[model samples]
Target: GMFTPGNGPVQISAEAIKKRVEELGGEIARDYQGKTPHLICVLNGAFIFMADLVRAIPLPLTMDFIAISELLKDLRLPIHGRDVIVVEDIVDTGLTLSYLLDYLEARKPASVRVAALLSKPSRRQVEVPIHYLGFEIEDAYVYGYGLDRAQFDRNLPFITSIRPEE
Candidate 1:
């Protein structure tokens, strides 16, 4: 119980995540059609979701990664005049997403959109667009499925909520 914390209670089961990922993948496949979109994974948190998501997409898509840093970051792939999708683990205050959009926009990509695994709409300090979404969770202390608690529990296949609020 010390390290794992008894697994908590499953807020989003593994099955649910898989199904939703597949659905979103199909949607993206249909929308992009002949065009190949460059997927940008917001590293550390988004790696797992990005892996599963790309497998679901049937198109020949390219990928890259971006990370939050004090000095700002740039993609290795040139995004100018290309369709791009920013993949993120969660959307809470929208602060990070907003900043990312502003930075990416400055590069002049032909189009840009967001795909997030989780969102807390109630906690949003700024409004941002999420063209693809996995789930909208109520305000809670969520972890697992790439979201960690005290730097543990990230690899858990299911998303768990330790505190669901009173």
Candidate 2:
């Protein structure tokens, strides 16, 4: 049972995820009226989040993907004069995203914001602004809903948590 998919206790259900995503989409659409926001999906974990979020938005938008590679050079699209939103799966330590923020700033976008699906404030190593958030969760080992455990179970539609082993 320990190695099985979807075996962990559910933290956020599929229905809850859909509802919150729709709400977030509406909020973003309202904020960027008459403008197209460039959504930069942080790859590996954020691909699924971006997929659902882009569809929920009611306006035309562009997208790109970036990974932990080469500072700012990994992003393919030019962000100059564009409104950029970095869609991340989770924000815990705030270190990686803060470094990413610095990279995005160097390209001179019109504005930059963060949209994270989950946050763990108790483990924060640095301060970072989450402009748009889906949920604030307690510090736990979470997986599913685009998060993986030992590189598996990322496809589960609901979020799950389990006791961590030393």
Candidate 3:
């Protein structure tokens, strides 16, 4: 069902995304109610989601930023005694997420967890823990809800496959 290049059918509605984030926020608040969790947001992909998530979480929390790259370990954060939570957009191949987990864990944080908006288990080259997830989608090119394709259509309110509709 090939078609012209554009957004595909709605894979996730905006309402659904909002509901998922609210649930994620509620779970996090309950999990770390008395403790202050430092949220380390993975950049670019997680920017918009991370911002919304931070506000959604009613817990008293601090946040920082770290992009997925070689110098990720060298962040300027006080994570030594903090319960660190890495907010991510998607965990596809698991390569970046695995590296991030190891890098952060070695720094001696009291605890480290992952909060992902999407997951593609079939596409993973390895396994990693995803404590919070918005959706588990099939292996396909997807965009929207802050996930982009060549920096296009990321501002769209809902998520969609890359393939155009028939």
lDDT (C-alpha, whole model) for all candidates:
0.86, 0.86, 0.84
Candidates by TM-score, descending order: 2, 1, 3
Candidate 3: list runs displaced more than 4 Å: 1-10, 72-74, 164-166
- Model 1, 9-117: lDDT tens digits are 4378878999999999999999999898999999778888899999999999899988873424567998998899999999999999999898889999999989999
Top candidate when judged by TM-score against the true structure = 2
State every prediction's TM-score relative to the real structure: 0.90, 0.91, 0.89
- The residue-level lDDT of candidate 3 at 138 comes to 84
Query: What's the true lDDT of residue 146 in model 1?
Result: 81
TM-score of structure candidate 1: 0.90
Model 2 per-residue lDDT tens digits across residues 42-143: 877877888888888998889999886355438888998999999999999998899999988989999998999999999899999998898999887888
Worst 10 residues of 1 by lDDT: 1-10
